[PDB]
């Protein structure tokens, strides 16, 4: 999936910004970083 190697300052950061990145609407902090799962 989308692994930008970005630590999670909250899963709610990635889920919003990862939208602007690619084309996804879903990102979660699972392994300590924000991974996007489209």
d(CA 30, CA 32): 6
Contact between 34 and 27 (Cβ < 8 Å): yes
Return the C-alpha torsion angle 33, 25, 3, 10, nearest 10. -10
CB 15 within 8 A of CB 27: yes
Q: How many CB atoms lie under 10 A from the CB of residue 35?
A: 21
- Residue 23's domain comprises 2-36
Burial class (CB in 10 A: 0-12, 13-18, 19+), 13: middle
Give the span between the Cα atoms of 13 and 17, in whole angstroms: 6
Q: How many domains does the chain have?
A: 1
Per-residue CA distances from 11 to 15, 16, 29 (Å): 6, 9, 5
Q: How was this structure determined?
A: NMR
State CA 28 to chain mean position distance. 5
CATH number at residue 22: 3.30.30
């Amino acid at each position: 999936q989308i692994d930008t190697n970005v630590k999670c300052s909250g899963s709610s950061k990635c889920v919003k910004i990862c939208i602007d990145r690619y084309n996804t609407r879903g990102a979660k902090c699972i392994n300590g970083r924000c991974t996007c799962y489209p």
